[PDB]
Subunit: 331 residues, 4 copies
């Protein structure tokens, strides 16, 4: 308009050329938790939202845009069309059918396959070089699904996996000791949720392992009953869902932590879900959480945790179960 | 005990504590924004619905690894709010269809006669920040019930209205809203006043370049920007059912000024008797200096006669409702 | 270690948000620490001709890595270390000596820039250039000429720190945070800068509308002394501590933030103003500029009084009178 | 006051104030790090050279627009430090060539007999963080002159040594130092102790994979990492003449745990009489829990016989000198 041209003289015709762009697919509670956390950590210069419900999608977009004065992310966009996501560095998948009472993982996954067969090829088309971060449950199997459909190399398809399980473990460990979770170390690996593995040998403060002071740590003979910390981790989502109906804030913060390592090329070590065929005795195409070095090319390296026979067996059983489900999937 | 050796029988007194009352979408957006900005060393949540409260508290605690707020607590018992520097009220009644204004406001008075005295009892020195709508009269109600001096009872007012104005302003100009200046004042919502004489970029008044700016003669109809602001909450509610994120960021911005004693200027709701021709105890949004004692100073905005009449009218409407309230 | 970490990907890292600082004097290291603590870069490169000092500064920054989010800090006298920078900040140059004319001082900076700038352009053809070396406005012209860059990608820090100082002093007078005190100092950085009194305001309330003599000798609040303090600032600080560093470092990192995050905020920085503001020469002067990922894309047009006009024109004449004598 | 109307007679007092004593390169690096981490609502600087002091203050004030610390003050008079939560001591004297270690400490005692009583008069409830070298003995000196309980007198100790270890470890492994764990304890400087048993990534002890880790038979020669840690300051001093940036960031990390009550674990200098077989009043670095009350708890590291003997030898040297100081 004329007033704008009285106020401002334009000296450059510029192109879009997005530079540090993140897409979040799905604007349910998880997706919007991821979105607000990413915004308040200044990780992106452009944020795109995608979902199939157009009213909801646009109203979330607008609500975020109205806070722009208080943010440092200049462009917030949304559309049901995936061209809005073009040139993302990182695309976060939180969409999918949510599990019904009594529904098996096989049935739920199969319900999601038709959804992912639409989303993933669309994401890959408009951002052929992006990293894919899968959050939708069940996380380990859906990361496999996204990997197979995308054709992406394994380093660029990542499941959020046990990142939050380990965060929950450290929160509860810290509450017990009276120390901040940042200084309380412990790793929950393997399958996300009920079959995860607390690696008791690695639980430590300031490099002092608890098991060195308490040889019964994590067993039924343990006088402090640290096995119940892992049980609380396993039961956390059910507990929160019972009180408030869903979880959102912690997974959103967890996912923004992963986004930070990717966008900033930090090469921090995260318990996240990666294709571990060839490692820990696994012989099939399976995604499980191990400590992964996460940076600008996704997962480039893994730490080799020394596992006991019991821990290794729990891992192999998960991989067998996972593979048993996956080979029954109709793509 | 074998791992950690205690050396100090110390007792924990909260130094920079904030309480949010109400854990609906508005209160939780305030909570998450306050946690992300590292403004409190303790966050307390209060609501009457005990399971939903506890579940929100737990969801936040599970993210502690990613935060710098080492204690997050909740309870329907207001003792958990003790020693808050700042208490943010988002609870209240929603209008029933066919219910009248005063009657809705009176129901809010009855609600606040429980909430405010419990807040005052455990944090006698806190600042009170009222976000519940309708904000201007409910700030008055909180002020009356609390007994606090006026500098320590604040309404969020037109803070979000102005941020929306600066967002829409920035879209027309291709400029970041941080560099687009404009002020919406008065009664939050439909009767608010955009002060066209102050709209500027880099100290260049837009009205000086477009003398009809804001009027019906405006060739670019910039009054539609203020209409978009007035309709904003309505459009978003229609689309997604409620608003949460923008009000949360806006309230965290006020909390930052208070907790860090910044003395930035915000368009917030304060008790303006004595100014802009107002004679009664009424709260309207003007530019306020916000710091560790609340609102200590106001910027005197030169208003046109039409603008001044609008402020006076909405002050009359507010006082008409307020003098019928039963405390 | 191969037993501990198993490599899964053969990767060649390309930095995506790299910044270079040229010159590791006090101004350069202040820009460096501020940029690191604002998490603006995924890689920081330092360049300087003093090899020992340069390496000691790099090591000292690297030892703080644990407390930072910038995973790679490198340095060399060789500009290959700067390859693929989004943003290159020049603080190096010559300092005037006893008996040396201004023209000769600037010419020594030209000859220095004739080594630095072509090396910067060799390794980062698409970078934005931010010139901090004094005399700022002339040397931004020198860098632009030598680089062959289009004007949107050569930025001089200009009056950014001057306006920040004005806003600090304004906030001290009023008891308001400088974030809420608005005023613009434009034109030439330093002695000949121009305070645009018409724009000084709080919350959109122009102080001149309340005080018609604002900024004049008849002003009873004597606001002219605020600008005089702005002009004298560097001199007072240099007299007391020997140099200035912290403030310019913070203001450069504020500029770096708008560029790296494509914010399109408005800053009083030095841009090639030929054909604008009544100016006819290829000269750099500070006006309110829209700063983003392509540099300066747009300029706000401040309405100037006749006095303000004449001062900007006079600065343009002064700058051009020097620039036309230079040997590139 | 046509522009601003005052509404409140406030006698403002600082709520989150930090003081830095000494504006040499270490002190100013501490200051800029603390300003940029938004840790304080007021920052005070103190030193004996008035021109240098005022100029550093002015240089910081001129960046206020880019900060969130609304008051920055300085003086040589300690009244400017009143009501500090935390006071950081970086001032002192450097060992001249041919000067005995005992004489150097005593010269620092004499300076501290002026500094510490003035700090304590104006901030009787502060935590004291001693950065001046040699840190371990000077934390003792400040403790004795202040009369403070041990929890409130903290030496920066081995915090930076461990950060350098983790930097060098991360460089060897291709991993960010945040994910590389290792602890350097004891006396800051040539005699520090690297606790090889705690060195790990993701809870995987490197010693479990390499039993010779840190010994002369170590095929990867990790002992050279701790030698680099010990030689670091000397190398950087040789190249640029002093060190500043890293110690500044390290101090601001400790200030963060104090100001925000984080209760993180840091390898810092604390009175450890009663632990590790030590029977005198000496300060050494062990893993401490750091919060709003200073050092409240300590992690009990299992030390091998060699490691226990290094720590006890440092204790003996420390006490040997401390025994001979004139207070």
């Amino acid at each position: 308009a004329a007033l704008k041209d009285q106020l401002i003289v334009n000296l450059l015709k510029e192109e879009q050329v997005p530079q540090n762009k993140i897409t979040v697919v799905g604007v349910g509670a998880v997706g919007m938790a991821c979105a607000i956390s990413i915004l308040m950590k200044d990780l992106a210069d452009e944020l795109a939202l995608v979902d199939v419900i157009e009213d909801k999608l646009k109203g979330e977009m607008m609500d975020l845009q109205h806070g722009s004065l208080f943010l440092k992310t200049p462009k917030i966009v949304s559309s049901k069309d995936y061209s809005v996501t073009a040139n993302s560095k990182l695309v976060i998948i939180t969409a999918g059918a949510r599990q019904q009472e009594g529904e098996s993982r096989l049935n739920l996954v199969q319900r999601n396959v038709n959804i992912f067969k639409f989303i993933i090829p669309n994401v890959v088309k408009y951002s052929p070089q992006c990293k894919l971060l899968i959050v939708s449950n069940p996380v380990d199997i859906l990361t496999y699904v996204a990997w197979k459909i995308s054709g992406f190399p394994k380093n660029r398809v990542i499941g959020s996996g046990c990142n939050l399980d380990s965060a929950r473990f450290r929160y509860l460990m810290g509450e017990r000791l009276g120390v901040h979770p940042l200084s309380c170390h412990g790793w929950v690996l393997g399958e996300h949720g009920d079959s995860s593995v607390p690696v008791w040998s690695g639980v430590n403060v300031a490099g002092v392992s608890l098991k060195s002071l308490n040889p019964q740590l994590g067993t039924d003979a343990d006088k402090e009953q640290w096995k119940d910390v892992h049980k609380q981790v396993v039961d956390s989502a059910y507990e929160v869902i019972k009180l408030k109906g869903y979880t959102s804030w912690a997974i959103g913060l967890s996912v923004a932590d992963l986004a930070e390592s990717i966008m900033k090329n930090l090469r921090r070590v995260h318990p996240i879900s990666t294709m571990i065929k060839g490692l820990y005795g696994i012989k099939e195409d399976v995604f499980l959480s191990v400590p992964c070095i996460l940076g600008q090319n996704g997962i480039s390296d893994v730490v080799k945790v020394t596992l006991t026979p019991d821990e290794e067996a729990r891992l192999k059983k998960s991989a067998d179960t996972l593979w048993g489900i996956q080979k029954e999937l109709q793509f």
